[PDB]
Design an enzyme around this catalytic site. Structure first.
Site, mmCIF file in Angstrom:
data_model
loop_
_atom_site.group_PDB
_atom_site.id
_atom_site.type_symbol
_atom_site.label_atom_id
_atom_site.label_comp_id
_atom_site.label_asym_id
_atom_site.label_seq_id
_atom_site.Cartn_x
_atom_site.Cartn_y
_atom_site.Cartn_z
ATOM 1 N N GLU B 303 0.836 -1.145 -0.241
ATOM 2 C CA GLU B 303 0.060 -0.076 -0.024
ATOM 3 C C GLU B 303 0.831 1.238 0.053
ATOM 4 O O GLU B 303 0.711 2.192 -0.740
ATOM 5 C CB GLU B 303 -0.883 -0.039 1.059
ATOM 6 C CG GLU B 303 -1.990 1.088 1.068
ATOM 7 C CD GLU B 303 -3.121 1.347 2.149
ATOM 8 O OE1 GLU B 303 -3.034 0.811 3.320
ATOM 9 O OE2 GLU B 303 -4.194 1.926 1.924
ATOM 10 N N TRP B 325 -7.928 -2.257 -1.049
ATOM 11 C CA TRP B 325 -8.833 -1.415 -1.950
ATOM 12 C C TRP B 325 -9.478 -2.324 -2.813
ATOM 13 O O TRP B 325 -9.996 -1.641 -3.997
ATOM 14 C CB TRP B 325 -7.893 -0.256 -2.723
ATOM 15 C CG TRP B 325 -7.029 0.768 -1.817
ATOM 16 C CD1 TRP B 325 -5.970 0.301 -1.396
ATOM 17 C CD2 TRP B 325 -7.414 2.039 -1.562
ATOM 18 N NE1 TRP B 325 -5.548 1.672 -0.500
ATOM 19 C CE2 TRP B 325 -6.605 2.551 -0.820
ATOM 20 C CE3 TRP B 325 -8.542 2.842 -1.938
ATOM 21 C CZ2 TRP B 325 -6.719 3.759 -0.449
ATOM 22 C CZ3 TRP B 325 -8.672 4.111 -1.543
ATOM 23 C CH2 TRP B 325 -7.682 4.649 -0.646
ATOM 24 N N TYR B 351 -4.504 9.171 -2.534
ATOM 25 C CA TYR B 351 -3.189 9.607 -1.779
ATOM 26 C C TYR B 351 -2.041 9.592 -2.783
ATOM 27 O O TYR B 351 -1.599 10.529 -2.711
ATOM 28 C CB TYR B 351 -2.929 8.047 -0.850
ATOM 29 C CG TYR B 351 -4.018 8.263 0.154
ATOM 30 C CD1 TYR B 351 -3.732 8.933 1.139
ATOM 31 C CD2 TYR B 351 -5.010 7.053 0.186
ATOM 32 C CE1 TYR B 351 -4.748 8.913 2.345
ATOM 33 C CE2 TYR B 351 -5.912 6.856 1.181
ATOM 34 C CZ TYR B 351 -5.733 7.678 2.388
ATOM 35 O OH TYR B 351 -6.641 7.406 3.250
ATOM 36 N N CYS B 411 -9.106 8.802 4.419
ATOM 37 C CA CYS B 411 -9.393 8.527 5.897
ATOM 38 C C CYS B 411 -8.324 9.367 6.485
ATOM 39 O O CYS B 411 -8.606 10.070 7.552
ATOM 40 C CB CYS B 411 -9.556 6.851 6.159
ATOM 41 S SG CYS B 411 -11.131 6.324 5.920
ATOM 42 N N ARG B 431 -9.608 11.622 9.961
ATOM 43 C CA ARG B 431 -10.910 12.276 10.061
ATOM 44 C C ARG B 431 -11.734 10.938 10.287
ATOM 45 O O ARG B 431 -12.879 11.265 10.914
ATOM 46 C CB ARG B 431 -11.392 12.395 8.406
ATOM 47 C CG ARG B 431 -11.630 11.499 7.823
ATOM 48 C CD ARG B 431 -12.250 11.977 6.398
ATOM 49 N NE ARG B 431 -12.467 10.662 5.440
ATOM 50 C CZ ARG B 431 -13.416 10.036 5.281
ATOM 51 N NH1 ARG B 431 -14.571 10.233 6.216
ATOM 52 N NH2 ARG B 431 -13.393 9.146 4.529
ATOM 53 N N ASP B 434 -11.847 3.358 12.305
ATOM 54 C CA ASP B 434 -12.377 2.081 12.772
ATOM 55 C C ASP B 434 -11.432 1.483 13.835
ATOM 56 O O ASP B 434 -10.193 0.876 13.201
ATOM 57 C CB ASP B 434 -12.558 1.327 11.470
ATOM 58 C CG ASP B 434 -12.766 -0.153 11.559
ATOM 59 O OD1 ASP B 434 -13.118 -0.428 12.938
ATOM 60 O OD2 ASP B 434 -13.199 -0.975 10.637
#
Ligand SMILES: NC(=O)C1=CN([C@@H]2O[C@H](COP(=O)(O)OP(=O)(O)OC[C@H]3O[C@@H](n4cnc5c(N)ncnc54)[C@@H](OP(=O)(O)O)[C@@H]3O)[C@@H](O)[C@H]2O)C=CC1
Ligand SMILES: NC(=O)C1=CN([C@@H]2O[C@H](COP(=O)(O)OP(=O)(O)OC[C@H]3O[C@@H](n4cnc5c(N)ncnc54)[C@H](OP(=O)(O)O)[C@@H]3O)[C@@H](O)[C@H]2O)C=CC1
Ligand SMILES: CC1(C)N=C(N)N=C(N)N1OCC(=O)Nc1ccc(Cl)cc1
Ligand SMILES: CC1(C)N=C(N)N=C(N)N1OCC(=O)Nc1ccc(Cl)cc1
Lengths: 532, 526
Positions: B303, B325, B351, B411, B431, B434
């Site tokens: 990632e 993703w 990103y 996120c 922001r 989880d």
């Protein structure tokens, strides 16, 4: 002496009295009016009053029996002593004061004139004898003004539990001026709202002018920075007042305590100009806007300027001239020929600050031209969008407003200090996180707290919600070295109860606010300080 | 009983010994060829000094009045333990030295250094002495005998999170007998992580009243705020000191289970939410990879490498079996996003695009964007190297113009970097968090990232600071997180980056090693 043996405490509640204003602790002195209290109900005070005057600790009495029995050579309830006017002010339904041993001082009245379970006494002397012959935990002097005056004069009060009611009422009787050599404040509570007034609770103290898992703590501290190599050793004697306080629960200590951590533990860095700061990285402050407006009290602040700036943002303006015509100089220095030139903005008009807050809030992604252009329906109207999300998708986790447009940074007079606001909605209440990349604790942050608290109120109102928490995240948190002396003065001032902000409630639209829709009530504050 | 009256505590340090299940027994390496398994671990040797020497005389009278009715500390060794000590310190810097032995008589040592015949002959020696507490220093046989004869109360257990060659072992502490009550901060000494835990044997105050008055308003008379019970956070609530950095994560789980707002989300699953938390982890002392459950890092490292490359092509990950993703690139998902004209697994300007080309017009995920938009990643590196006191070192992924083109908004909003005395700290603002599934991966992601930026700028990583905005626990994660809160963290592992890598674009999956990851077993958060 006699005050320590018998644990004779005083408890009172004082408001401001009918009178460019200077404030000391004598500001809060109004005790009653026309035989009763100056105010209708302040329920939170009344509940504090009960909690303190009825609280006993069973286990602790044993050692107080011993102490008192030794001095005399020899359910648990507290004693409460009141003047006859005070006693007469109580409604029948609450006489005698529940769960407490009631005593009354009086010359005109004797036992025969009372139905109720009460001790009558005609002498201060007679009380001390009474306490000698009684089992009680603590003895609290309830007032009124005459009873307070003589128990003080007679050096009899160990501590004054003192409610600052931060509003003004017609008063005919007053608390005695407390000699600051005799009594010093050692505690200050959280600030609160009850019956449309802020108040806190402060404890004055008199002067003289399984313990197996306590050892486990000392162990888990074998690897601590000693007193000597604690970076910048600034002198104790300087922060005498600040370090004397036992409980620092006033929300202003959230700001004050960051100044302290930066002064005592801050990293020394020479900065953008060649000046000098102390810096640390990553703080959070939380301010309950339902309970108070967190305008700092340890020095004077005016909000006209920063409210004009906030209205100027919401309009999408980038024109410094508009603020200067309102005699607001907050952006003047970032708008000069010298400055725009040093930011390589040679082709930019004086006071044309480029695509800053206002422009990013209403027009994010539109090409900036000049500060006079009509940018209508150009770029993303972030402010309108978040007002809609708060209204229609309140649980949304994407209610950010962002000023940090990476593409436009070099075209701004300087990048935004205040990077973003995230909003949160539960049970008709709005909270607001604001992330600040660069925070001048000394001049900037006091204002920055004030600006976003006002903004939370405005959004909350035009969305038919109630302001809850304003949460302030500091990135690079720094103190300018020339501010240090001024901040030392400030850390030794004791906060007053915060004021309250009133928004004209007829304003239903974020754009429809104007200066006169903003009223700060009951700002009680220490003296102006030049950080310079 | 004897062990409470007299105050008999053990004090040990156990390293690890030569797939793999972990438990407390993992740590048991005691010694080797008559000496400690490791060269020198000076923080544990310093902890050893403090704990054995420390005295509080104002709580000795309370001991004196219980001890008789039945100032320094007593320290008990065994010959090979007494012996292995380098000469130049014996006795041990002012403690009552004492040696269990068979073939050693009290004559051929001094008049302070009391020898003992058997285990039963120590209770004799204590009842006639003036000492604070009694520390069994070991070694193997001494601990075995003193534990077998339920003599030991607390155990001051140092967990050495590295493997060594050992010829002697601490006994398997019976966990129905003893139990952990305190865990310390995690620390690096001498190129290993370690922590300090405590096994206990099972069963003016004018200002203290002023404290109670100040609490007169609280909304806690015990009314069950959320339907989450007391007896379920037993182990969690049964610890005195919880100073292990993993408690920063665990305590947020607890706060949100206890005090969280009940809320609908988009999915409809149901969450408990709170708003605004900080976590700080010390990257100079550990790698904060949660120990209270198995976590895997290949995917989240791919990632990151994908971000650095500027990629928005969801398929580059899917072909490497990194499915982070997958859901956000399906036809069905992009259609619900109103992205009807976007190819499956084209995640839009997310990103990687924003880090390398912020401001550039996104076309599709196969276009060439060389030297278009702002290469923020390049820019924060130069700033770190050339202007480290800058307060403008932000990497921002939240591009307001492009949000609607993204499969989803970031996120992780932004990283801000800070530089002092050749050390790099990082704040990530998130922001939406989880806590059950996401946050543990998110902590690891930006910690690694913080190391990568650090290395390629010739700085040491200091603090990774994680600011949570909307912090939510999924109602359907609460059983799993209950199981998790009542686990006790192990000392954290460490991250070794291939040191040859000196530009941010040159890291491959090979250049990343996790070391000494001692962990509890996997949990299906569902
Ligand atoms: N990691 C840790 O926390 C600690 C462990 N160590 C390590 O431990 C190792 C030593 O382990 P181990 O071989 O068990 O050595 P011990 O420390 O247990 O020493 C054993 C010795 O103690 C005496 N002894 C043993 N049992 C008794 C008894 N019942 N009554 C009286 N005296 C007794 C001696 O008898 P005799 O006179 O017959 O020899 C015996 O040789 C070393 O490698 C050392 O470095 C070091 C310190 C603490
Ligand atoms: N804001 C607050 O914290 C508080 C408010 N108050 C307010 O204060 C007012 C009452 O105060 P104030 O008017 O000063 O009067 P007090 O309540 O102090 O009553 C004074 C009276 O008590 C008796 N007395 C007092 N001292 C002695 C003594 N040493 N020996 C004998 N008798 C003594 C006398 O009664 P006698 O006339 O019978 O001789 C005297 O006139 C009210 O408005 C009340 O609501 C009162 C308490 C707390
Ligand atoms: C209640 C009040 C005003 N608050 C504080 N902090 N301390 C006091 N002395 N208070 O007054 C209490 C009192 O003596 N009078 C009183 C008046 C009405 C009722 Cl119902 C009960 C007590
Ligand atoms: C040092 C060590 C392994 N760590 C802890 N926590 N407590 C112990 N029991 N340790 O062993 C100390 C000991 O008994 N022996 C010893 C070894 C070397 C020196 Cl220099 C001093 C004491």
């Amino acid at each position: 002496q006699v005050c320590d043996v018998f644990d004779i405490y005083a408890i009172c509640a004082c408001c401001k009295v009918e009178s460019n204003e200077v404030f000391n602790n004598y500001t809060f002195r109004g005790l009653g009016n026309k035989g009763v209290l100056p105010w209708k109900c302040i329920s939170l005070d009344m509940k504090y009053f009960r909690a303190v005057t009825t609280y006993v600790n069973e286990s602790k009495y044993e050692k107080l029996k011993y102490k008192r029995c030794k001095y005399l050579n020899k359910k648990l309830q507290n004693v409460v002593v009141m003047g006859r006017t005070n006693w007469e002010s109580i409604p029948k339904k609450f006489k005698p004061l529940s769960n407490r041993i009631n005593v009354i001082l009086s010359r005109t009245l004797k036992k025969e004139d009372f139905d109720e379970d009460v001790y009558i006494i005609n002498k201060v002397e007679d009380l001390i004898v009474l306490l000698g012959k009684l089992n009680y935990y603590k003895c609290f002097i309830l007032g009124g003004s005459v009873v307070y005056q003589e128990f003080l004069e007679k050096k009899l009060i160990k501590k004054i539990y003192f409610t600052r009611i931060n509003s003004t009422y017609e008063c005919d009787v007053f608390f005695p001026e407390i000699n600051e050599n005799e009594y010093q404040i050692i505690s200050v509570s959280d600030v609160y709202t009850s019956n449309n007034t802020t108040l806190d609770f402060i404890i004055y103290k008199k002067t003289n002018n399984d313990d197996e898992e306590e050892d486990d703590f000392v162990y888990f501290n074998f690897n601590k920075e000693k007193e000597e190599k604690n970076k910048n050793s600034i002198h104790p004697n300087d922060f005498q007042i600040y370090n004397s306080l036992k409980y620092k629960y006033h929300p202003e200590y959230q700001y004050l305590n960051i100044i302290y951590d930066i002064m005592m533990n801050g990293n020394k860095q020479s900065d953008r100009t060649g000046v000098g700061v102390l810096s640390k990285f990553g703080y959070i402050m939380k301010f309950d806007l339902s309970q108070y407006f967190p305008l700092l009290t340890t020095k004077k602040l005016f909000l006209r300027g920063i409210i004009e700036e906030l209205l100027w943002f919401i309009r999408g303006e980038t024109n410094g001239n508009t603020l200067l015509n309102k005699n607001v100089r907050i952006w003047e220095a970032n708008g000069t020929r010298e400055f725009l030139d040093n930011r390589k903005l040679f082709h930019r008009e004086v006071n044309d600050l480029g695509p800053i807050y206002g422009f990013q809030w209403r027009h994010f992604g539109a090409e900036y031209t000049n500060m006079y252009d009509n940018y209508e329906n150009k770029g993303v109207d972030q402010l309108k969008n978040i007002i809609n999300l708060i209204k229609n998708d309140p649980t949304s986790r994407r209610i950010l407003l962002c000023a940090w447009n990476v593409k436009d940074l070099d075209q701004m007079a300087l990048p935004p200090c205040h990077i973003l606001c995230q909003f949160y909605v539960f049970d008709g209440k709005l909270s607001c996180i604001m992330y600040q990349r660069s925070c001048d604790l000394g001049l900037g942050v006091p204002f920055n707290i004030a600006s976003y608290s006002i903004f939370t109120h405005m959004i909350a109102q035009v969305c038919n919600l109630q302001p809850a928490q304003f949460i302030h995240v500091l990135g690079n948190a720094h103190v300018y070295n020339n501010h240090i002396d001024s901040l030392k003065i400030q850390l030794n001032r004791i906060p007053y109860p915060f004021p309250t902000l009133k928004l004209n409630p007829d304003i239903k639209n974020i754009e429809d606010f104007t200066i006169s829709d903003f009223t700060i009530q009951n700002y009680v504050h220490h003296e102006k300080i030049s950080m310079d």
